[PDB]
C-alpha cells in the first residue's frame, strides 16, 4: 500500500479503458477494424521466437535466484549456533540450480530451427512458419514459468528443512521427499515444452 497503490491504479484504469473501447467498437458496428488476423500476421514471427528464447532462461534464472537466497539466509542464520549443519544442507541449493540447468538446456533445444527467410507478405511466410513461431514461443513461456514456480517451491521447502534440522539432527532424512516432489513439476514443464516444440520445421 506504500506504493502498490500506483500499480493497482494502473491496472484498474487499463482494464476499464479496455472495456470502454471494446463496447464502443461493438455497438458502433465498427468491428471490421478489430482484425485480430492483421495483428497476428503482420507481426513477423521472429519477434515472438526471440521473446520465447529469452524468456525460457529469464524465468528459470529468476526462480533459481529466488530459491538460493531464500534458503541461504536461513541456513546461515541457523549455522551461527549450529555449525554442524553448514555443509549438510548443500542439497537444497543443488536442487535450486538444477532448474537453471534445465532452463539452459531447453534454450539450446529451442534455439535450433532458426532459418531466416525472405518473405514479406503473410501468404509468402505461410502456415508452417506461423505455426513454428507460435509453438516455440508457447513452449518457451511454459518452461520458463514452470521452472520459476518449481524453484520457488523447492526454495521454500529447503528453508523449512534447514530451519528444522538445526534442532534435532535426525530429521534431515525425512524431509527430502517433499523436495523431490517439488522437483517433479520442474521436470514436467521441460517435457511438456519438448512435446510442444517437437514438430517445428521453420524455413
Amino acid at each position: 500500500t506504500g506504493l502498490e497503490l500506483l500499480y493497482l491504479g494502473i491496472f484498474v484504469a487499463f482494464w476499464a479503458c479496455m472495456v470502454v473501447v471494446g463496447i464502443c467498437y461493438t455497438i458502433f458496428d465498427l468491428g471490421f477494424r478489430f482484425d485480430v488476423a492483421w495483428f497476428l500476421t503482420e507481426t513477423s514471427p521472429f519477434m515472438w521466437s526471440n521473446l520465447g528464447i529469452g524468456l525460457a532462461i529469464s524465468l528459470s534464472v529468476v526462480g533459481a535466484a529466488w530459491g538460493i537466497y531464500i534458503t541461504g539466509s536461513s541456513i546461515i542464520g541457523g549455522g551461527v549456533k549450529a555449525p554442524r549443519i553448514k555443509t549438510k544442507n548443500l542439497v537444497s541449493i543443488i536442487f535450486c540450480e538444477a532448474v537453471a540447468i534445465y532452463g539452459i538446456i531447453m534454450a539450446i533445444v529451442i534455439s535450433n530451427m532458426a532459418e531466416p527467410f525472405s518473405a514479406t507478405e503473410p501468404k509468402a511466410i505461410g502456415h508452417r512458419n506461423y505455426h513454428a513461431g507460435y509453438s516455440m514461443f508457447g513452449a518457451g513461456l511454459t518452461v520458463g514459468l514452470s521452472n520459476l514456480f518449481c524453484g520457488v517451491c523447492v526454495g521454500i521447502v529447503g528453508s523449512g528443512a534447514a530451519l528444522a534440522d538445526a534442532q534435532n539432527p535426525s530429521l534431515f532424512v525425512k524431509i527430502l521427499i517433499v523436495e523431490i516432489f517439488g522437483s517433479a513439476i520442474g521436470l514436467f514443464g521441460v517435457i511438456v515444452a519438448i512435446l510442444q516444440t517437437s514438430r517445428v520445421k521453420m524455413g
Partner: protein
C-alpha cells in the same frame, strides 16, 4: 580398511595415575570413553580437584587480562613444560595468590585517581552554579532545563579538547563543563534534582565575590596540583609488580595440562573395588606398542611398581576413523573431510581427487600464459617454505593460500598444458605455421578469382571441400580459428561434446567403485539386486549417447552435409517413442530394434530395485518366525532419488563448457579493448604510452581473472568433486580421532 582395531581397554589403577595419563597424552595416541551410566557432572570422585583447578584458572586469567591492560607482552619462547604432578602445585598456587593480593591493593589506590580528576574540574572553572557533565548528554539535558524552568534560567557550555580519564573504568571518555544562572532561591533548590541525574558532584559553591573567589580557587588548585604530582608515585611500584607477569606463563601452560589430566580422570571408571579403575580407550593397532612405551614412562615416576598391563577387548559398537597424512597430501584430505566424515572401512578418495582436481581445473582453465603466471606464484610461495614457516604472519588469505600451495601448483602446471592444447595463450594462438587451408592457385582452380573487390564490404564464407584441402593438426587445435569470424560455432560445438563426454566418463569412474565395498562388507543382497541394476541402467541410457556421438563425429563426411542428422532430436525421439517416417534419417542400419531394446530394458530395470529386495527380506523374516512397509518406503525413496538425481547430475555437467567459454571471451576482450590501442603510428613517443598501457592491462587482468574468477572456478571444481561424485558410493557417516595430544 583405514584401521583394524582401536576400541580396547588397557588401563589399571595406580597410586600416581596422573603421571601415567600425562605421559600417555604427551604421546598423543589415545581417546578415552566411559560414563555410560550417566552419573551427573556434579557428583564425581574427582570433582574437588577440578573445582580448585577451575578457580586457579579463572584467577590467572584475571591477572593475564590485567597485564594485557598495561600493554606488556609475553615471551612465548619457552619450551614445553613438564607436568608438576604432586599436590604441592596447590600450595604453589597459594604463592601465586600472594601476587594478586598486592594487585588488589593497586585497584584500591586507583580510586585515589578520583581525587586527581576532582581538582582538574576546578581548572576549567577558571572560566549561580557550575558543574561537569557528560558531553553526549547535552541535548536531553537542555531540553529538560527548558521543561522544568521555562527559560527563567540560562545555560552556557564549554568543553575540553583533551579527553578525560575515567576514575572507574580508566576510559578517556568525553566530558564538558556547564554554567547555569538563575534569579531566585527556589531555582537553586529545584535544579539539583535535575543536575544530580547527570553526574556532577564537584561544585565550588559561592563563597566570595568573583575576584577573591578566583584567587582562592587558583591558590588551592595549584597547591593540590603539587600534591597530586607528589603522590602519583604509586605508578612506579605498580609497574615494578607488573613486570613479573612473564615468569609463570609456563606455569599457566602446565596448569592447563594437569587440569585436562584431572578432567580425563573425571571421566575414568567409577568402580574402585580391589583398586580396579579400568577406563576404555581408542588407540589404533599399529601404535599399540607405542602405548606400552608410555606405560614404562609411568613406572619411571609412579612408585606403585605394578605391571599396569591389560588385555585388549573386542566391541560390537562402531569405531572411529583416522587418516595418516604426509606433508604433500594435507590440503587434499582437509578438502575431503570438509565434504564429510567417512564411515569405518571406506575407500579414501584422496588419490583420485589429488589428480582429478587439477585436471578439472585445467578443463575449466584453458589458457597457457595464465598457467605460467599461476605456476610462478606457486613456486614463489613454495621456495620460501623455510623462511615463511619461521615467520610471523597476520593475513588470513596468506595462510589459506599457503595451506593450498600444493593444489595451486598442481593446477597451475596442468593449466599450462591444457592451455597449450587449447591454443589460446593470452587470447592469441601459438601458430607453429602448419596451416594447410588456402593457397591462391588452388582457390582459383575452384572458380574464385578477384571476388575481394565486392568483398571489401562483405565477409565471404568459403564452402569447404573444393577437393584440394583439409588436414587435421597434431599440435592441439589448428591455429587459423583465432581470427575466423565463425570460430564461435565450432568452438562451442567442440566444448559441448567435450564437456558431456568427460562428465559421463568421470561419473562412470565415480559410480563403479561401490561394488568393491559391497563385496568387502559381505552383503550379497545389496550387490546382486543392488549395484547391478544401477550400472545397467546408467550404461544403457548414456553409453548409447557416447557411442552415437562418436559415430556422428567419425562417419558423416563433409560431402553429406545436407541430410546429416541431429543427435538431440534422435535422443528425444527415443525418449518419447515417436517414430516419424520422414524428416530425419536413421543414424545407422538396424537402429529400430537396438534402440527399442535398449529403452525397454532400461525401463524394465527399475522394478527390480523398486520392489524385489524387501519381499526377500520379509521372506527370510517370516522364515525365522521389522516394519516391512518402512523398508519398502525407504528403498523406493532411494531408488526414485537415484533415478532423478542421476538425470540431474548428467544434466549438470555443462559448467565445464560455461567456464571455458567465459574464459575465452574474457581473454579476447581484455586483449582487444585496452592494450590493443598500443598499436599506433607514433615514431618517438609510442613506447612511452605503451609503458603505462601495459601496466594498466597487466594490473586489470590480475584483478579480474587471476584472483576472483579463478576462485569461482576452483570452488565449482570442488562442488563437482563433492556432489555429483560422492553421492554414488560415499555414505559419509563416521567420526575422526580427537586425540589426547596436549596443546
Amino acid at each position: 580398511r583405514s584401521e583394524e582395531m582401536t576400541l580396547a581397554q588397557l588401563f589399571l589403577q595406580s597410586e600416581a595415575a596422573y603421571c601415567c595419563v600425562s605421559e600417555l597424552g604427551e604421546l598423543g595416541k589415545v581417546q578415552f570413553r566411559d560414563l555410560n551410566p550417566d552419573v551427573n557432572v556434579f557428583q564425581r570422585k574427582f570433582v574437588n580437584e577440578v573445582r580448585r583447578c577451575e578457580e586457579m584458572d579463572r584467577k590467572l586469567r584475571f591477572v593475564e587480562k590485567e597485564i594485557r591492560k598495561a600493554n606488556i607482552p609475553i615471551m612465548d619462547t619457552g619450551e614445553n613444560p613438564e607436568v608438576p604432578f604432586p599436590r604441592d602445585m596447590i600450595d604453589l598456587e597459594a604463592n601465586f595468590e600472594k601476587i594478586e593480593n598486592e594487585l588488589k591493593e593497586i585497584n584500591t589506590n586507583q580510586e585515589a585517581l578520583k581525587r586527581n580528576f576532582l581538582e582538574l574540574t576546578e581548572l576549567k572553572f577558571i572560566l549561580f552554579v557550575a558543574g561537569v557533565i557528560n558531553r553526549e548528554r547535552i541535548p536531553t539535558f537542555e531540553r529538560m532545563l527548558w521543561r522544568v524552568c521555562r527559560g527563567n534560567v540560562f545555560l552556557r557550555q564549554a568543553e575540553i579538547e583533551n579527553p578525560l580519564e575515567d576514575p572507574v573504568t580508566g576510559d578517556y571518555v568525553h566530558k564538558s563543563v556547564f554554567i547555569i544562572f538563575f534569579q531566585g532561591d527556589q531555582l537553586k533548590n529545584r535544579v539539583k534534582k535535575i543536575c544530580e541525574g547527570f553526574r556532577a558532584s564537584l561544585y565550588p559553591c559561592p563563597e566570595t565575590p568573583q575576584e577573591r573567589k578566583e584567587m582562592a580557587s587558583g591558590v588551592n588548585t595549584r597547591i593540590d596540583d603539587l600534591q597530586m604530582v607528589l603522590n602519583q608515585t604509586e605508578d612506579h611500584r605498580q609497574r615494578v609488580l607488573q613486570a613479573a607477569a612473564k615468569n609463570i606463563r609456563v606455569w599457566f601452560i602446565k596448569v592447563r595440562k594437569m587440569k585436562a589430566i584431572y578432567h580425563t580422570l573425571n571421566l575414568c571408571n567409577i568402580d574402585v573395588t580391589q583398586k580396579c579403575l579400568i577406563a576404555e580407550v581408542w588407540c589404533p593397532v599399529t601404535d599399540l606398542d607405542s602405548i606400552q612405551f608410555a606405560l614404562r614412562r609411568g613406572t619411571e615416576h609412579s612408585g606403585s611398581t605394578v605391571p599396569s598391563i591389560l588385555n585388549r577387548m573386542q566391541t560390537n559398537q562402531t569405531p572411529p576413523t583416522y587418516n595418516k597424512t604426509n606433508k604433500f597430501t594435507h590440503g587434499f584430505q582437509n578438502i575431503v573431510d570438509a565434504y564429510g566424515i567417512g564411515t569405518y572401512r571406506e575407500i579414501n578418495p584422496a588419490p583420485y581427487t589429488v589428480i582429478t582436481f587439477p585436471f578439472l581445473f585445467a578443463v575449466m582453465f584453458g589458457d597457457f600464459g595464465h598457467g605460467i603466471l599461476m605456476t610462478l606464484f606457486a613456486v614463489w610461495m613454495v621456495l620460501r617454505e623455510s623462511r615463511i614457516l619461521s615467520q610471523k604472519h597476520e593475513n588470513e588469505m596468506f595462510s589459506m593460500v599457503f595451506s593450498g600451495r600444493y593444489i595451486i601448483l598442481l593446477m597451475g602446471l596442468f593449466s599450462i598444458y591444457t592451455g597449450l592444447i587449447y591454443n589460446d595463450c593470452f587470447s592469441k594462438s601459438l601458430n607453429i605455421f602448419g596451416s594447410s587451408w588456402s593457397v591462391r592457385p588452388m582457390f582459383t582452380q575452384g572458380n574464385w578469382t578477384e571476388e575481394t573487390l565486392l568483398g571489401s564490404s562483405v565477409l565471404q564464407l568459403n564452402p569447404a571441400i573444393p577437393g584440394v584441402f583439409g588436414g587435421p593438426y597434431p599440435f592441439g587445435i589448428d591455429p587459423i580459428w583465432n581470427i575466423a569470424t565463425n570460430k564461435l560455432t565450432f568452438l562451442n560445438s567442440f566444448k559441448m561434446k567435450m564437456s558431456v563426454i568427460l562428465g559421463i566418463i568421470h561419473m562412470l569412474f565415480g559410480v563403479s567403485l561401490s561394488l568393491f565395498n559391497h563385496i568387502y562388507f559381505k552383503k550379497p543382497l545389496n550387490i546382486y539386486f543392488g549395484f547391478i541394476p544401477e550400472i545397467i541402467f546408467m550404461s544403457s541410457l548414456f553409453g548409447y549417447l557416447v557411442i552415437l556421438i562418436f559415430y556422428k563425429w567419425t562417419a558423416y563426411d563433409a560431402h553429406s552435409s545436407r541430410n546429416a542428422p541431429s543427435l538431440l532430436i534422435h535422443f528425444i525421439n527415443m525418449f518419447l517413442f515417436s517414430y516419424p517416417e520422414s524428416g530425419n534419417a536413421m543414424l545407422y542400419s538396424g537402429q529400430k530394434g537396438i534402440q527399442c531394446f535398449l529403452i525397454v530394458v532400461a525401463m524394465l530395470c527399475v522394478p527390480w530395485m523398486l520392489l524385489f529386495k524387501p519381499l526377500i527380506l520379509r521372506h527370510q523374516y517370516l522364515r525365522k518366525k521389522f516394519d516391512f512397509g518402512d523398508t519398502m518406503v525407504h528403498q523406493a525413496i532411494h531408488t526414485i532419488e537415484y533415478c532423478l538425481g542421476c538425470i540431474s547430475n548428467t544434466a549438470s555437467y555443462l559448467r565445464l563448457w560455461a567456464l571455458s567459454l567465459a574464459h575465452a571471451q574474457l581473454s579476447e576482450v581484455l586483449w582487444t579493448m585496452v592494450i590493443h590501442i598500443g598499436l599506433h603510428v607514433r615514431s618517438l613517443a609510442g613506447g612511452l604510452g605503451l609503458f603505462f598501457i601495459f601496466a594498466a592491462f597487466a594490473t586489470l587482468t590480475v584483478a579480474i581473472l587471476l584472483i576472483m574468477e579463478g576462485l569461482s572456478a576452483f570452488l565449482h571444481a570442488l562442488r563437482l568433486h563433492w556432489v555429483e561424485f560422492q553421492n554414488k558410493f560415499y555414505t559419509g557417516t563416521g567420526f575422526k580421532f580427537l586425540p589426547f595430544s596436549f596443546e
